[PDB]
Amino acid sequence: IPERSKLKFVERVPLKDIRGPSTEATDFTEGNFAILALGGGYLHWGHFEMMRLTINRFMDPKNMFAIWRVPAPFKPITRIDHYVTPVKTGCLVVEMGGRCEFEEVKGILNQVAHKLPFPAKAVSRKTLERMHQNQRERELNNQNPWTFEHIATANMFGIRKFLSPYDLTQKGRYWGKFYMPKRV
Amino acid sequence: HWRVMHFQRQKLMAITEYIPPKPAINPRCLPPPPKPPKEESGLVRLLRQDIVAVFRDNRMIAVCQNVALSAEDKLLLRHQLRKHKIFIKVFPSQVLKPFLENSKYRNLLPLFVGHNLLLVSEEPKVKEMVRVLKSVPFLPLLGGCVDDTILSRQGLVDYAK
Amino acid sequence: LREVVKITVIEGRITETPKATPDPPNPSGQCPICRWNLKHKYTYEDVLLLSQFIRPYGGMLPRRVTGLCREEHRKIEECVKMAHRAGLLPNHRPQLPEGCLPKDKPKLNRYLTRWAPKSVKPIYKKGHRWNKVGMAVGSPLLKDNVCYSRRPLKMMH
Protein backbone atom coordinates (compact mmCIF):
# COMPACT_ATOMS: atom_id res chain seq x y z
CA ILE A 1 0.00 0.00 0.00
CA PRO A 2 1.53 3.34 -1.03
CA GLU A 3 1.91 5.75 1.88
CA ARG A 4 0.16 8.56 -0.03
CA SER A 5 -2.86 6.41 -0.80
CA LYS A 6 -5.20 9.41 -1.01
CA LEU A 7 -5.42 11.40 -4.22
CA LYS A 8 -3.16 14.44 -4.38
CA PHE A 9 -4.32 18.00 -5.01
CA VAL A 10 -4.28 19.51 -8.51
CA GLU A 11 -3.04 23.02 -9.27
CA ARG A 12 -5.70 25.34 -10.69
CA VAL A 13 -3.00 27.41 -12.43
CA PRO A 14 0.23 25.67 -13.58
CA LEU A 15 -9.26 20.76 -31.84
CA LYS A 16 -7.48 17.47 -32.55
CA ASP A 17 -6.33 17.02 -28.94
CA ILE A 18 -9.60 15.14 -28.29
CA ARG A 19 -10.51 14.15 -31.87
CA GLY A 20 -8.80 10.76 -32.13
CA PRO A 21 -7.89 7.49 -30.43
CA SER A 22 -5.77 7.97 -27.34
CA THR A 23 -2.10 7.00 -27.24
CA GLU A 24 -1.42 7.56 -23.52
CA ALA A 25 -2.75 6.19 -20.23
CA THR A 26 -4.31 3.29 -22.16
CA ASP A 27 -2.76 0.58 -19.94
CA PHE A 28 -3.05 -0.19 -16.24
CA THR A 29 0.19 0.76 -14.46
CA GLU A 30 -0.23 -0.06 -10.76
CA GLY A 31 -3.92 -0.41 -9.93
CA ASN A 32 -6.42 -3.03 -11.03
CA PHE A 33 -9.55 -0.84 -11.25
CA ALA A 34 -9.81 2.42 -13.19
CA ILE A 35 -12.23 4.68 -15.06
CA LEU A 36 -12.05 4.48 -18.86
CA ALA A 37 -12.92 7.46 -21.03
CA LEU A 38 -15.38 6.48 -23.77
CA GLY A 39 -15.34 9.89 -25.48
CA GLY A 40 -13.40 13.08 -26.05
CA GLY A 41 -13.86 15.86 -23.53
CA TYR A 42 -12.15 18.58 -21.52
CA LEU A 43 -11.65 18.09 -17.77
CA HIS A 44 -11.60 21.40 -15.91
CA TRP A 45 -10.48 21.79 -12.30
CA GLY A 46 -14.04 21.44 -11.00
CA HIS A 47 -14.19 17.87 -12.28
CA PHE A 48 -10.79 17.22 -10.69
CA GLU A 49 -12.11 18.23 -7.27
CA MET A 50 -15.17 15.99 -7.58
CA MET A 51 -12.97 12.99 -8.37
CA ARG A 52 -10.53 13.85 -5.57
CA LEU A 53 -13.11 14.48 -2.83
CA THR A 54 -15.42 11.58 -3.69
CA ILE A 55 -12.72 8.93 -4.12
CA ASN A 56 -10.65 10.01 -1.11
CA ARG A 57 -13.54 9.89 1.36
CA PHE A 58 -14.64 6.35 0.46
CA MET A 59 -11.26 4.66 0.02
CA ASP A 60 -9.82 2.82 3.01
CA PRO A 61 -6.19 3.86 3.70
CA LYS A 62 -5.30 0.41 5.04
CA ASN A 63 -6.52 -1.56 2.02
CA MET A 64 -6.95 0.94 -0.84
CA PHE A 65 -4.94 3.50 -2.80
CA ALA A 66 -5.30 5.67 -5.89
CA ILE A 67 -3.20 7.66 -8.35
CA TRP A 68 -3.74 10.19 -11.14
CA ARG A 69 -3.22 9.10 -14.75
CA VAL A 70 -3.69 12.49 -16.47
CA PRO A 71 -1.76 15.78 -16.37
CA ALA A 72 -2.96 18.89 -14.59
CA PRO A 73 -4.84 21.58 -16.56
CA PHE A 74 -2.43 23.29 -18.95
CA LYS A 75 -4.40 24.41 -22.04
CA PRO A 76 -5.38 28.11 -22.05
CA ILE A 77 -9.01 29.14 -22.51
CA THR A 78 -10.17 32.67 -23.35
CA ARG A 79 -13.58 34.33 -23.28
CA ILE A 80 -7.07 33.21 -19.85
CA ASP A 81 -10.21 32.41 -17.87
CA HIS A 82 -9.17 28.87 -16.91
CA TYR A 83 -7.22 25.83 -18.10
CA VAL A 84 -8.71 22.50 -19.19
CA THR A 85 -6.95 19.13 -19.37
CA PRO A 86 -7.67 17.48 -22.74
CA VAL A 87 -8.58 13.79 -22.80
CA LYS A 88 -8.94 11.35 -25.69
CA THR A 89 -11.28 8.38 -25.94
CA GLY A 90 -9.67 5.31 -24.41
CA CYS A 91 -7.75 7.21 -21.73
CA LEU A 92 -7.73 6.04 -18.11
CA VAL A 93 -8.60 9.15 -16.11
CA VAL A 94 -7.84 7.69 -12.67
CA GLU A 95 -6.40 4.39 -11.44
CA MET A 96 -7.30 2.57 -8.22
CA GLY A 97 -5.90 -0.55 -6.62
CA GLY A 98 -5.49 -2.52 -3.43
CA ARG A 99 -6.60 -5.73 -1.71
CA CYS A 100 -10.18 -5.22 -2.89
CA GLU A 101 -12.40 -6.70 -5.58
CA PHE A 102 -13.81 -4.71 -8.49
CA GLU A 103 -17.37 -4.96 -7.17
CA GLU A 104 -16.42 -2.94 -4.09
CA VAL A 105 -15.12 -0.03 -6.19
CA LYS A 106 -17.72 -0.36 -8.97
CA GLY A 107 -20.28 1.92 -7.33
CA ILE A 108 -17.97 4.82 -6.54
CA LEU A 109 -16.07 4.64 -9.84
CA ASN A 110 -19.29 4.46 -11.86
CA GLN A 111 -20.80 7.34 -9.88
CA VAL A 112 -17.67 9.43 -10.45
CA ALA A 113 -17.62 8.54 -14.15
CA HIS A 114 -21.23 9.66 -14.64
CA LYS A 115 -20.37 13.22 -13.54
CA LEU A 116 -17.33 13.47 -15.83
CA PRO A 117 -17.70 15.89 -18.77
CA PHE A 118 -17.45 13.02 -21.28
CA PRO A 119 -18.90 9.49 -21.40
CA ALA A 120 -16.84 7.16 -19.23
CA LYS A 121 -16.94 3.75 -17.59
CA ALA A 122 -15.33 1.88 -14.71
CA VAL A 123 -13.22 -1.04 -15.95
CA SER A 124 -10.91 -3.47 -14.17
CA ARG A 125 -7.92 -5.12 -15.83
CA LYS A 126 -10.09 -8.09 -16.84
CA THR A 127 -12.89 -5.94 -18.27
CA LEU A 128 -10.48 -3.84 -20.34
CA GLU A 129 -8.89 -7.02 -21.68
CA ARG A 130 -12.32 -8.47 -22.45
CA MET A 131 -13.35 -5.33 -24.34
CA HIS A 132 -10.29 -5.50 -26.58
CA GLN A 133 -10.79 -9.23 -27.16
CA ASN A 134 -14.41 -8.65 -28.18
CA GLN A 135 -13.32 -5.89 -30.56
CA ARG A 136 -10.78 -8.16 -32.24
CA GLU A 137 -13.22 -11.08 -32.28
CA ARG A 138 -15.85 -8.97 -34.03
CA GLU A 139 -13.38 -7.91 -36.72
CA LEU A 140 -12.15 -11.45 -37.42
CA ASN A 141 -15.59 -13.09 -37.62
CA ASN A 142 -17.38 -10.25 -39.43
CA GLN A 143 -19.51 -11.67 -42.24
CA ASN A 144 -19.74 -8.39 -44.16
CA PRO A 145 -17.33 -8.64 -47.12
CA TRP A 146 -17.13 -4.85 -47.38
CA THR A 147 -15.35 -2.80 -44.72
CA PHE A 148 -14.80 0.93 -44.34
CA GLU A 149 -11.03 0.75 -44.80
CA HIS A 150 -11.06 -1.14 -48.10
CA ILE A 151 -13.67 1.12 -49.70
CA ALA A 152 -11.98 4.31 -48.47
CA THR A 153 -8.37 3.28 -49.16
CA ALA A 154 -9.16 1.97 -52.65
CA ASN A 155 -11.35 5.01 -53.45
CA MET A 156 -14.13 2.66 -54.52
CA PHE A 157 -17.35 4.38 -55.65
CA GLY A 158 -15.57 7.75 -55.72
CA ILE A 159 -16.05 7.85 -51.96
CA ARG A 160 -13.11 10.08 -51.04
CA LYS A 161 -14.91 13.09 -52.51
CA PHE A 162 -17.16 12.90 -49.42
CA LEU A 163 -14.47 11.88 -46.89
CA SER A 164 -11.93 13.84 -44.89
CA PRO A 165 -8.24 12.91 -45.15
CA TYR A 166 -8.25 11.80 -41.51
CA ASP A 167 -11.08 9.34 -42.15
CA LEU A 168 -8.72 6.82 -43.75
CA THR A 169 -6.69 6.51 -40.54
CA GLN A 170 -9.68 6.29 -38.19
CA LYS A 171 -11.49 3.80 -40.46
CA GLY A 172 -14.92 5.00 -39.35
CA ARG A 173 -14.58 4.01 -35.69
CA TYR A 174 -14.29 7.67 -34.66
CA TRP A 175 -16.53 10.51 -35.87
CA GLY A 176 -15.74 13.98 -34.58
CA LYS A 177 -15.19 13.73 -30.83
CA PHE A 178 -17.37 10.60 -30.50
CA TYR A 179 -16.20 6.98 -30.51
CA MET A 180 -18.45 4.29 -31.99
CA PRO A 181 -17.56 0.94 -30.36
CA LYS A 182 -19.74 -1.43 -32.39
CA ARG A 183 -18.57 0.11 -35.67
CA VAL A 184 -15.83 -2.27 -36.81
CA HIS B 1 -23.64 18.16 -30.75
CA TRP B 2 -24.20 15.88 -33.74
CA ARG B 3 -23.23 17.25 -37.15
CA VAL B 4 -25.19 15.82 -40.06
CA MET B 5 -23.27 13.59 -42.47
CA HIS B 6 -23.61 13.79 -46.24
CA PHE B 7 -26.07 11.19 -47.52
CA GLN B 8 -23.37 9.38 -49.50
CA ARG B 9 -21.23 9.16 -46.37
CA GLN B 10 -24.21 7.87 -44.39
CA LYS B 11 -24.84 5.30 -47.13
CA LEU B 12 -21.26 4.07 -46.73
CA MET B 13 -21.73 3.55 -42.99
CA ALA B 14 -25.02 1.72 -43.61
CA ILE B 15 -23.34 -0.78 -45.94
CA THR B 16 -20.20 -1.33 -43.81
CA GLU B 17 -22.02 -2.40 -40.65
CA TYR B 18 -20.66 -5.44 -38.83
CA ILE B 19 -22.54 -8.69 -39.50
CA PRO B 20 -22.05 -11.42 -36.86
CA PRO B 21 -21.97 -15.13 -37.74
CA LYS B 22 -25.12 -17.05 -36.85
CA PRO B 23 -25.10 -20.66 -35.59
CA ALA B 24 -27.27 -23.34 -37.15
CA ILE B 25 -28.47 -24.55 -33.73
CA ASN B 26 -28.38 -22.57 -30.50
CA PRO B 27 -25.85 -24.16 -28.11
CA ARG B 28 -28.47 -24.31 -25.34
CA CYS B 29 -30.88 -26.60 -27.19
CA LEU B 30 -28.04 -28.93 -28.14
CA PRO B 31 -27.17 -31.76 -25.74
CA PRO B 32 -25.28 -30.38 -22.75
CA PRO B 33 -21.49 -30.37 -22.95
CA PRO B 34 -19.76 -33.09 -20.92
CA LYS B 35 -19.63 -32.03 -17.30
CA PRO B 36 -16.40 -30.23 -16.31
CA PRO B 37 -14.56 -32.51 -13.87
CA LYS B 38 -15.59 -31.69 -10.32
CA GLU B 39 -13.23 -31.66 -7.34
CA GLU B 40 -13.77 -32.79 -3.75
CA SER B 41 -13.02 -30.12 -1.15
CA GLY B 42 -10.83 -31.20 1.75
CA LEU B 43 -13.77 -30.74 4.11
CA VAL B 44 -15.78 -33.33 2.16
CA ARG B 45 -12.87 -35.78 2.29
CA LEU B 46 -12.62 -35.17 6.03
CA LEU B 47 -16.42 -35.24 6.28
CA ARG B 48 -16.49 -38.61 4.53
CA GLN B 49 -13.89 -39.87 7.01
CA ASP B 50 -15.98 -38.50 9.89
CA ILE B 51 -19.04 -40.48 8.81
CA VAL B 52 -16.88 -43.59 8.40
CA ALA B 53 -15.24 -42.97 11.78
CA VAL B 54 -18.52 -42.62 13.69
CA PHE B 55 -19.91 -45.81 12.15
CA ARG B 56 -16.73 -47.75 12.98
CA ASP B 57 -16.62 -46.49 16.57
CA ASN B 58 -20.34 -46.57 17.40
CA ARG B 59 -22.05 -49.96 17.23
CA MET B 60 -25.58 -48.53 17.55
CA ILE B 61 -26.83 -45.78 15.21
CA ALA B 62 -30.40 -44.59 15.80
CA VAL B 63 -32.28 -41.93 13.83
CA CYS B 64 -34.25 -39.19 15.61
CA GLN B 65 -35.86 -36.35 13.68
CA ASN B 66 -34.24 -32.92 13.95
CA VAL B 67 -36.01 -29.84 15.31
CA ALA B 68 -33.38 -27.11 14.74
CA LEU B 69 -33.55 -26.20 18.42
CA SER B 70 -31.60 -23.15 19.58
CA ALA B 71 -27.91 -23.89 20.01
CA GLU B 72 -27.87 -23.15 23.74
CA ASP B 73 -31.19 -24.96 24.21
CA LYS B 74 -29.76 -27.79 22.09
CA LEU B 75 -26.73 -27.81 24.39
CA LEU B 76 -29.16 -28.23 27.30
CA LEU B 77 -30.45 -31.48 25.79
CA ARG B 78 -26.91 -32.36 24.69
CA HIS B 79 -25.73 -31.74 28.26
CA GLN B 80 -28.37 -34.17 29.53
CA LEU B 81 -27.32 -36.68 26.87
CA ARG B 82 -23.65 -36.03 27.66
CA LYS B 83 -24.42 -36.78 31.31
CA HIS B 84 -25.70 -40.13 29.99
CA LYS B 85 -22.57 -40.41 27.79
CA ILE B 86 -24.73 -40.48 24.64
CA PHE B 87 -23.59 -38.21 21.81
CA ILE B 88 -25.41 -36.36 19.03
CA LYS B 89 -24.18 -36.28 15.44
CA VAL B 90 -25.31 -34.14 12.50
CA PHE B 91 -23.95 -34.47 8.98
CA PRO B 92 -24.61 -33.19 5.45
CA SER B 93 -26.37 -36.42 4.52
CA GLN B 94 -25.57 -35.74 0.85
CA VAL B 95 -22.20 -37.33 1.64
CA LEU B 96 -23.81 -39.87 3.99
CA LYS B 97 -25.86 -41.42 1.17
CA PRO B 98 -22.85 -42.80 -0.82
CA PHE B 99 -21.85 -44.87 2.20
CA LEU B 100 -25.38 -46.14 2.85
CA GLU B 101 -25.65 -47.01 -0.84
CA ASN B 102 -22.75 -49.48 -0.45
CA SER B 103 -22.23 -50.44 3.20
CA LYS B 104 -23.41 -52.88 5.86
CA TYR B 105 -26.45 -50.60 6.34
CA ARG B 106 -28.40 -50.19 3.10
CA ASN B 107 -32.07 -50.20 4.21
CA LEU B 108 -31.66 -47.15 6.48
CA LEU B 109 -31.90 -44.65 3.61
CA PRO B 110 -35.69 -44.29 4.14
CA LEU B 111 -35.11 -43.63 7.84
CA PHE B 112 -32.70 -40.80 7.02
CA VAL B 113 -34.91 -37.87 6.00
CA GLY B 114 -33.24 -34.49 5.53
CA HIS B 115 -33.19 -32.75 8.92
CA ASN B 116 -32.88 -35.88 11.06
CA LEU B 117 -30.51 -35.94 14.02
CA LEU B 118 -28.29 -38.97 14.60
CA LEU B 119 -27.80 -40.94 17.82
CA VAL B 120 -24.43 -42.53 18.58
CA SER B 121 -22.93 -44.19 21.65
CA GLU B 122 -20.90 -47.20 22.75
CA GLU B 123 -23.55 -48.76 25.03
CA PRO B 124 -27.12 -49.77 24.07
CA LYS B 125 -28.94 -47.68 26.69
CA VAL B 126 -32.04 -47.87 24.51
CA LYS B 127 -34.42 -47.65 27.47
CA GLU B 128 -32.67 -44.49 28.67
CA MET B 129 -32.64 -43.20 25.08
CA VAL B 130 -36.44 -43.47 25.03
CA ARG B 131 -36.46 -41.85 28.48
CA VAL B 132 -34.30 -39.00 27.17
CA LEU B 133 -36.74 -38.72 24.26
CA LYS B 134 -39.59 -38.34 26.77
CA SER B 135 -37.82 -35.20 28.01
CA VAL B 136 -39.03 -33.38 24.88
CA PRO B 137 -42.64 -34.53 24.19
CA PHE B 138 -42.92 -33.61 20.51
CA LEU B 139 -39.41 -34.91 19.74
CA PRO B 140 -40.15 -38.13 17.79
CA LEU B 141 -38.00 -41.13 16.86
CA LEU B 142 -37.95 -42.55 13.33
CA GLY B 143 -35.87 -45.69 13.85
CA GLY B 144 -32.39 -46.84 12.93
CA CYS B 145 -30.10 -49.64 14.08
CA VAL B 146 -29.18 -50.70 17.62
CA ASP B 147 -26.31 -53.13 18.24
CA ASP B 148 -25.96 -53.50 14.44
CA THR B 149 -29.63 -54.59 14.16
CA ILE B 150 -31.91 -52.44 12.00
CA LEU B 151 -35.33 -51.85 13.55
CA SER B 152 -38.17 -49.34 13.74
CA ARG B 153 -39.45 -47.37 16.74
CA GLN B 154 -42.05 -49.96 17.76
CA GLY B 155 -39.43 -52.69 17.61
CA LEU B 156 -36.97 -50.45 19.46
CA VAL B 157 -39.51 -49.91 22.25
CA ASP B 158 -40.07 -53.67 22.43
CA TYR B 159 -36.30 -54.08 22.21
CA ALA B 160 -35.96 -51.58 25.06
CA LYS B 161 -37.72 -54.03 27.39
CA LEU C 1 -52.79 -34.83 -11.32
CA ARG C 2 -53.88 -34.58 -7.68
CA GLU C 3 -57.11 -32.80 -6.73
CA VAL C 4 -58.21 -31.80 -3.22
CA VAL C 5 -61.78 -32.70 -2.23
CA LYS C 6 -63.40 -31.48 0.99
CA ILE C 7 -66.20 -32.93 3.09
CA THR C 8 -64.58 -31.38 7.95
CA VAL C 9 -62.33 -33.89 6.18
CA ILE C 10 -60.24 -32.94 3.14
CA GLU C 11 -58.25 -35.34 0.96
CA GLY C 12 -56.22 -35.16 -2.22
CA ARG C 13 -56.71 -37.91 -4.81
CA ILE C 14 -54.13 -38.59 -7.52
CA THR C 15 -55.55 -39.34 -10.97
CA GLU C 16 -53.70 -40.64 -14.00
CA THR C 17 -52.82 -38.02 -16.61
CA PRO C 18 -52.29 -38.58 -20.36
CA LYS C 19 -48.64 -39.06 -21.27
CA ALA C 20 -46.54 -37.45 -23.98
CA THR C 21 -46.78 -38.89 -27.47
CA PRO C 22 -43.86 -41.35 -27.80
CA ASP C 23 -40.90 -41.01 -30.14
CA PRO C 24 -40.17 -37.26 -30.43
CA PRO C 25 -38.95 -36.42 -33.96
CA ASN C 26 -35.70 -34.90 -32.62
CA PRO C 27 -34.56 -36.72 -29.48
CA SER C 28 -31.71 -35.20 -27.44
CA GLY C 29 -33.61 -31.89 -27.43
CA GLN C 30 -33.24 -30.36 -23.98
CA CYS C 31 -36.41 -28.26 -23.89
CA PRO C 32 -39.81 -29.58 -25.07
CA ILE C 33 -40.13 -27.09 -27.94
CA CYS C 34 -36.73 -27.98 -29.39
CA ARG C 35 -37.38 -31.73 -29.17
CA TRP C 36 -40.11 -31.32 -31.82
CA ASN C 37 -38.22 -28.78 -33.97
CA LEU C 38 -40.57 -25.91 -33.09
CA LYS C 39 -37.93 -23.35 -32.10
CA HIS C 40 -38.97 -20.65 -34.61
CA LYS C 41 -42.24 -21.98 -36.05
CA TYR C 42 -45.01 -21.11 -33.56
CA THR C 43 -47.02 -17.88 -33.25
CA TYR C 44 -49.99 -16.65 -31.23
CA GLU C 45 -52.36 -18.39 -33.66
CA ASP C 46 -51.10 -21.85 -32.62
CA VAL C 47 -53.54 -22.46 -29.78
CA LEU C 48 -53.13 -26.24 -29.84
CA LEU C 49 -49.49 -25.90 -28.79
CA LEU C 50 -50.02 -22.96 -26.44
CA SER C 51 -53.01 -24.46 -24.61
CA GLN C 52 -50.83 -27.32 -23.35
CA PHE C 53 -48.95 -24.89 -21.06
CA ILE C 54 -52.06 -23.05 -19.79
CA ARG C 55 -53.97 -23.49 -16.55
CA PRO C 56 -57.71 -24.15 -16.86
CA TYR C 57 -58.45 -20.47 -16.13
CA GLY C 58 -55.94 -19.07 -18.64
CA GLY C 59 -52.86 -18.71 -16.45
CA MET C 60 -49.40 -19.82 -17.51
CA LEU C 61 -47.92 -22.92 -15.95
CA PRO C 62 -44.64 -22.60 -14.02
CA ARG C 63 -41.42 -22.99 -15.98
CA ARG C 64 -40.22 -25.88 -13.81
CA VAL C 65 -43.21 -28.11 -14.56
CA THR C 66 -43.22 -27.49 -18.31
CA GLY C 67 -39.42 -27.64 -18.52
CA LEU C 68 -39.17 -24.96 -21.21
CA CYS C 69 -35.99 -22.94 -21.53
CA ARG C 70 -36.09 -19.30 -20.46
CA GLU C 71 -36.03 -18.02 -24.04
CA GLU C 72 -39.01 -20.15 -25.05
CA HIS C 73 -40.85 -19.56 -21.77
CA ARG C 74 -40.84 -15.83 -22.49
CA LYS C 75 -41.99 -16.49 -26.06
CA ILE C 76 -44.72 -18.92 -25.00
CA GLU C 77 -45.90 -16.56 -22.26
CA GLU C 78 -46.10 -13.58 -24.62
CA CYS C 79 -48.06 -15.42 -27.32
CA VAL C 80 -50.62 -16.55 -24.74
CA LYS C 81 -51.36 -12.95 -23.78
CA MET C 82 -51.80 -12.16 -27.47
CA ALA C 83 -53.90 -15.31 -27.86
CA HIS C 84 -56.04 -14.29 -24.88
CA ARG C 85 -56.41 -10.70 -26.09
CA ALA C 86 -57.30 -11.99 -29.58
CA GLY C 87 -60.19 -14.08 -28.24
CA LEU C 88 -58.66 -17.43 -29.21
CA LEU C 89 -59.09 -19.11 -25.79
CA PRO C 90 -62.81 -18.78 -25.00
CA ASN C 91 -62.78 -21.69 -22.50
CA HIS C 92 -59.86 -20.43 -20.37
CA ARG C 93 -61.63 -17.35 -19.02
CA PRO C 94 -60.92 -15.97 -15.54
CA GLN C 95 -62.67 -17.37 -12.48
CA LEU C 96 -64.78 -14.35 -11.68
CA PRO C 97 -66.38 -14.54 -8.21
CA GLU C 98 -70.01 -15.60 -8.13
CA GLY C 99 -70.82 -12.01 -7.16
CA CYS C 100 -69.34 -10.67 -10.41
CA LEU C 101 -70.26 -10.69 -14.10
CA PRO C 102 -68.41 -9.82 -17.32
CA LYS C 103 -67.98 -6.12 -18.07
CA ASP C 104 -70.98 -6.51 -20.44
CA LYS C 105 -69.55 -4.22 -23.14
CA PRO C 106 -69.27 -5.25 -26.78
CA LYS C 107 -65.85 -6.69 -27.54
CA LEU C 108 -63.59 -5.18 -30.20
CA ASN C 109 -61.81 -7.74 -32.37
CA ARG C 110 -58.02 -7.67 -32.00
CA TYR C 111 -54.96 -9.61 -33.02
CA LEU C 112 -51.20 -9.19 -32.54
CA THR C 113 -51.74 -7.04 -29.44
CA ARG C 114 -48.42 -6.33 -27.73
CA TRP C 115 -49.75 -4.46 -24.68
CA ALA C 116 -52.76 -4.63 -22.41
CA PRO C 117 -55.48 -2.50 -24.06
CA LYS C 118 -56.37 -0.79 -20.77
CA SER C 119 -53.11 1.14 -20.35
CA VAL C 120 -52.22 2.40 -23.87
CA LYS C 121 -52.50 6.14 -24.43
CA PRO C 122 -53.85 7.58 -27.70
CA ILE C 123 -51.39 9.14 -30.14
CA TYR C 124 -52.83 12.64 -30.49
CA LYS C 125 -49.78 14.10 -32.29
CA LYS C 126 -48.88 11.51 -34.92
CA GLY C 127 -46.04 13.45 -36.57
CA HIS C 128 -45.07 14.18 -40.17
CA ARG C 129 -43.34 11.98 -42.77
CA TRP C 130 -39.90 11.41 -41.20
CA ASN C 131 -41.34 12.11 -37.76
CA LYS C 132 -44.17 9.55 -37.55
CA VAL C 133 -45.02 8.06 -34.17
CA GLY C 134 -45.38 4.33 -34.75
CA MET C 135 -48.10 1.97 -33.55
CA ALA C 136 -46.53 -1.28 -32.36
CA VAL C 137 -47.85 -4.54 -33.82
CA GLY C 138 -46.77 -7.97 -32.65
CA SER C 139 -44.12 -8.76 -30.08
CA PRO C 140 -40.36 -8.19 -30.46
CA LEU C 141 -39.72 -11.54 -28.77
CA LEU C 142 -40.83 -13.22 -32.01
CA LYS C 143 -38.49 -11.34 -34.36
CA ASP C 144 -36.45 -14.54 -34.83
CA ASN C 145 -39.37 -16.52 -36.28
CA VAL C 146 -39.05 -17.86 -39.80
CA CYS C 147 -40.24 -15.25 -42.30
CA TYR C 148 -41.67 -16.08 -45.73
CA SER C 149 -41.82 -12.49 -47.01
CA ARG C 150 -39.40 -10.60 -49.23
CA ARG C 151 -38.19 -8.40 -46.34
CA PRO C 152 -38.57 -8.54 -42.56
CA LEU C 153 -42.00 -8.03 -41.04
CA LYS C 154 -43.24 -4.50 -40.33
CA MET C 155 -43.43 -4.35 -36.54
CA MET C 156 -44.22 -0.62 -36.38
CA HIS C 157 -47.37 0.37 -38.27
Binding site: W146, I151, A154, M156, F157 | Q10, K11, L12, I15 | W130
Partner: peptide
Protein backbone atom coordinates in the same frame (compact mmCIF):
# COMPACT_ATOMS: atom_id res chain seq x y z
CA UNK D 1 -32.71 9.17 -40.73
CA UNK D 2 -32.14 5.63 -42.00
CA UNK D 3 -30.93 4.53 -45.44
CA UNK D 4 -33.41 2.77 -47.69
CA UNK D 5 -33.10 -0.83 -48.85
CA UNK D 6 -32.91 0.29 -52.48
CA UNK D 7 -29.99 2.58 -51.62
CA UNK D 8 -27.84 -0.01 -49.85
CA UNK D 9 -28.41 -2.79 -52.39
CA UNK D 10 -27.60 -0.66 -55.43
CA UNK D 11 -24.28 0.55 -54.01
CA UNK D 12 -23.15 -3.01 -53.27
CA UNK D 13 -23.84 -3.88 -56.91
CA UNK D 14 -21.63 -0.99 -58.00
CA UNK D 15 -18.96 -2.08 -55.53
CA UNK D 16 -18.97 -5.60 -56.99
CA UNK D 17 -18.56 -4.26 -60.54
CA UNK D 18 -15.73 -2.03 -59.32
CA UNK D 19 -14.23 -5.00 -57.47
CA UNK D 20 -13.95 -6.84 -60.78
CA UNK D 21 -12.37 -3.76 -62.36
CA UNK D 22 -9.59 -4.10 -59.78
CA UNK D 23 -8.89 -7.67 -60.88
CA UNK D 24 -8.86 -7.09 -64.64
CA UNK D 25 -6.45 -4.17 -64.15
CA UNK D 26 -3.86 -6.38 -62.40
CA UNK D 27 -2.69 -8.45 -65.41
Amino acid sequence: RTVSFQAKESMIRRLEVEAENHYWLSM
